[PDB]
Design a protein around this ligand. Sequence first.
Ligand SMILES: CC1=C(/C=C/C(C)=C/C=C/C(C)=C/CO)C(C)(C)CCC1
Length: 139
Amino acid sequence: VDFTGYWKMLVNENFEEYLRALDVNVALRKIANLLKPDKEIVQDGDHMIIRTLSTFRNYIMDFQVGKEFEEDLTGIDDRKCMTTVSWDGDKLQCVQKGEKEGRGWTQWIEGDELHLEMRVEGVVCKQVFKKVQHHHHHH
Ligand SMILES: CC1=C(/C=C/C(C)=C/C=C/C(C)=C/CO)C(C)(C)CCC1
């Protein structure tokens, strides 16, 4: 699988409960729930960049698959985790070790869809994005 591309959000299921389990404050949850971020992904060998792009703020991941790293979640819940993203067949599995139990996510492709299941403390949020071709500049 190659995740490289630009992807536009189609659905975002149960995001409020995911953010509440991360202790994101009420005012920021109100803002965040309205956002429909894009994903811009570049898979360059095992060097993976996943840019979560929104009109409010972006969240940038930039890591090596298979190598644990210190993930700085400033702008989300302002925690840090020891995070590992690994291949599991055609799926990408992420474990975010830290204060919250069961924190991580799974990402995969079906057809023209990027599927992303985010988890923390037994809460499940499911996002689906559609592959798109009209690009625009971002930071
Ligand atoms: C709460 C919050 C946000 C949440 C971002 C999230 C939850 C990003 C998850 C990224 C993953 C799981 C990438 C793998 O594709 C953004 C920054 C949009 C805007 C500010 C408030």
